[PDB]
Amino acid sequence: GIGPVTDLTISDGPVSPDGFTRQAILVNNQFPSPLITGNKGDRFQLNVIDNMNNHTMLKSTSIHWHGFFQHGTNWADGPAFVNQCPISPGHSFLYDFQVPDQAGTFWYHSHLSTQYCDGLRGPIVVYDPQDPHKDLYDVDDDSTVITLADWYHLAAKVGPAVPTADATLINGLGRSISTLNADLAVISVTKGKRYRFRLVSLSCDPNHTFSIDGHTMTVIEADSVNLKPQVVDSIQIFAAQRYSFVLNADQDIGNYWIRAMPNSGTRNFDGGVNSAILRYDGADPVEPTTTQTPSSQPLVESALTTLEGTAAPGSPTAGGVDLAINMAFGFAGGRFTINGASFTPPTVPVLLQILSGAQNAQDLLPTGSVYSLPANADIEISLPATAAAPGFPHPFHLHGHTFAVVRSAGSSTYNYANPVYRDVVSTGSPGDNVTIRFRTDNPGPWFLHCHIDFHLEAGFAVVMAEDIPDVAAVNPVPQAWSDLCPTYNALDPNDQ
Ligand SMILES: *[C@@H]1O[C@H](CO)[C@@H](O[C@@H]2O[C@H](CO)[C@@H](O[C@@H]3O[C@H](CO[C@H]4O[C@H](CO)[C@@H](O)[C@H](O[C@H]5O[C@H](CO)[C@@H](O)[C@H](O)[C@@H]5O)[C@@H]4O)[C@@H](O)[C@H](O[C@H]4O[C@H](CO)[C@@H](O)[C@H](O)[C@@H]4O)[C@@H]3O)[C@H](O)[C@H]2NC(C)=O)[C@H](O)[C@H]1NC(C)=O
Ligand SMILES: *[C@@H]1O[C@H](CO)[C@@H](O[C@@H]2O[C@H](CO)[C@@H](O[C@@H]3O[C@H](CO)[C@@H](O)[C@H](O)[C@@H]3O)[C@H](O)[C@H]2NC(C)=O)[C@H](O)[C@H]1NC(C)=O
Ligand SMILES: [Cu+2]
Numbered sequence: 173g174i175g176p177v178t179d180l181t182i183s184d185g186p187v188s189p190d191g192f193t194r195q196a197i198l199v200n201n202q203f204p205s206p207l208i209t210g211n212k213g214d215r216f217q218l219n220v221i222d223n224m225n226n227h228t229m230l231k232s233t234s235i236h237w238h239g240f241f242q243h244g245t246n247w248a249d250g251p252a253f254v255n256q257c258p259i260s261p262g263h264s265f266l267y268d269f270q271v272p273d274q275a276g277t278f279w280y281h282s283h284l285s286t287q288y289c290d291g292l293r294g295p296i297v298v299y300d301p302q303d304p305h306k307d308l309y310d311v312d313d314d315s316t317v318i319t320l321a322d323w324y325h326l327a328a329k330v331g332p333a334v335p336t337a338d339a340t341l342i343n344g345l346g347r348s349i350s351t352l353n354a355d356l357a358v359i360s361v362t363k364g365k366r367y368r369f370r371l372v373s374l375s376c377d378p379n380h381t382f383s384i385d386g387h388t389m390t391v392i393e394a395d396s397v398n399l400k401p402q403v404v405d406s407i408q409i410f411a412a413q414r415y416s417f418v419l420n421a422d423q424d425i426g427n428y429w430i431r432a433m434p435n436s437g438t439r440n441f442d443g444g445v446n447s448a449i450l451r452y453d454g455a456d457p458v459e460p461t462t463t464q465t466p467s468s469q470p471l472v473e474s475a476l477t478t479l480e481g482t483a484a485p486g487s488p489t490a491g492g493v494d495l496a497i498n499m500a501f502g503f504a505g506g507r508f509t510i511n512g513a514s515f516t517p518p519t520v521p522v523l524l525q526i527l528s529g530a531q532n533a534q535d536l537l538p539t540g541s542v543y544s545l546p547a548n549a550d551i552e553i554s555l556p557a558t559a560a561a562p563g564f565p566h567p568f569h570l571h572g573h574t575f576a577v578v579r580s581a582g583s584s585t586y587n588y589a590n591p592v593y594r595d596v597v598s599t600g601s602p603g604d605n606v607t608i609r610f611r612t613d614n615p616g617p618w619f620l621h622c623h624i625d626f627h628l629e630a631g632f633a634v635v636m637a638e639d640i641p642d643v644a645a646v647n648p649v650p651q652a653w654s655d656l657c658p659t660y661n662a663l664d665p666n667d668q
């Protein structure tokens with residue numbers, strides 16, 4: 173793919189991924205946005221050149237590199253008004269960071285408002301030259317990335333505040349009910365080879381239930397964390413999650429349906445909606461006629477475990493940490509709340525408030541939304557599901573960290589000995605109490621929020637202000653970052 177040192181030039185233009193033409197956001201003249209690649213420990217230098225001129229889809233921008241810890245580079249994490257002011261139209265801004273001790277499947281997306289829904293979102297793969305799962309497969313390359321995305325015929329700021337998708341795109345292609353002849357994505361395999369497929373959800377809202385007719389999948393990585401291998405025949409993947417799975421192309425040469433059923437919008441496969449094609453070399457270039465078997469081995473999150481057997485942080489007892497926090501979800505005045513507070517973006521980004529002299533979390537804006545975390549501590553956060561926060565199940569993402577999921581959705585058990593670790597978790601449905609743990613090893617303000625982007629826009633977020641006293645020393649900011657807020661604040665409102 174491109175990188176790890178490359179320009180990413182952002183513009184507006186026409187696209188037609190499901191056969192319907194609409195204006196959207198291009199990256200290096202491409203929709204969908206291009207794959208970025210590098211190797212474990214590389215320095216990424218991603219020069220984002222903002223040439224957008226359409227205020228309806230926002231002229232300004234900021235990009236989050238989803239899943240990277242950003243230790244010492246908190247200013248590069250991406251959330252607008254938490255870690256930076258937006259890049260302004262006609263300006264460039266260099267994200268310059270390293271990725272020590274991570275390897276797996278990631279993605280990048282606009283982290284300003286609901287802009288990524290309008291098309292600024294693509295996959296990232298960070299390869300490991302000693303990947304512990306390499307001997308399970310033969311092929312892992314640009315052609316084995318599989319992206320899932322929601323797509324809307326009206327733009328994010330033009331349609332309903334919580335819209336309903338017209339199409340699921342698989343690798344940027346798919347059909348809507350009015351475009352049943354649109355080109356489907358084709359994923360090529362050769363009989364007798366084994367493939368590491370890297371499944372990335374670029375979704376703004378729906379989750380997808382993914383399966384491939386006639387084949388099983390051996391899951392080996394979740395949200396960039398290596399797992400013990402687990403055979404499944406379907407994966408429910410929530411917005412912003414990733415999984416690697418190995419597919420053994422050991423069936424008859426032919427065409428097989430790839431299925432990605434969303435939880436909303438059109439949910440069937442009639443006319444080949446919500447679908448793509450797995451094509452064996454030597455097959456007729458036509459659509460599959462395969463039929464779906466019910467899933468008998470669906471992925472179950474509580475059954476996943478890390479490859480390295482990593483325990484949860486802290487003691488193997490409820491509340492056996494340094495600081496435990498419960499997040500009570502609600503809704504008031506058309507906005508989401510967490511512990512009674514709705515996040516509204518501040519005028520001065522939270523990181524710049526710290527760097528300008530705010531000495532504790534109580535001094536930070538917005539008041540009610542910011543949590544102090546002590547350094548070198550074990551933290552436990554519970555996120556009990558409730559119908560009081562509409563549009564559940566809500567998949568929450570913690571920036572700056574991987575976390576142990578000690579209790580998953582749909583499970584009553586707590587696992588401290590060998591839970592899965594990941595960075596986006598469904599908080600499930602009423603009766604659940606999804607509980608996560610992490611260690612504070614990364615000074616800076618980090619967002620924690622639902623990754624349904626329309627819910628984030630309606631305030632469903634808090635900020636974890638981790639080790640405020642060390643933030644300036646550990647995160648020296650570059651000159652170009654210091655210039656973002658004065659440039660942004662000088663813009664006319666219609667040029668934002
Ligand atoms: C910035 O980004 C936003 C968000 O993506 C863009 O917003 C879009 O706005 C339009 C205008 O309100 C929305 O309405 C629909 O527009 C489409 C597309 O129209 C274009 O292509 C047509 C060819 O198929 C063409 O005829 C159009 O040209 C006419 O309009 C322009 C502008 O007014 C004018 O200058 C020309 O002289 C022409 O008169 C245009 O180039 C259009 O197809 C839709 O029509 C359908 O629906 C209406 C009823 O709603 C009906 O009247 C029609 O018969 C038909 O069924 C409709 O007008 C559009 O939905 C928005 N898009 C999204 C994704 O939300 C915005 O345009 C961007 N700005 C720029 C400058 O690109
Ligand atoms: C989801 O799980 C969390 C974490 O277990 C639950 O919150 C915890 O609930 C118990 C009360 O049932 C609290 O214990 C009590 O603490 C008080 C004050 O310290 C003490 O005086 C009592 O004797 C009792 O031990 C606990 O503090 C609370 N934890 C936190 C961090 O807030 C939560 O209720 C669960 N929610 C659902 C819907 O299941
Ligand atoms: Cu993300």
Ligand SMILES: [Cu+2]
Nearest residue numbers: 566622624627
């Ligand atoms: Cu949500």
Ligand SMILES: [Cu+2]
Nearest residue numbers: 251569619621
């Ligand atoms: Cu975020």
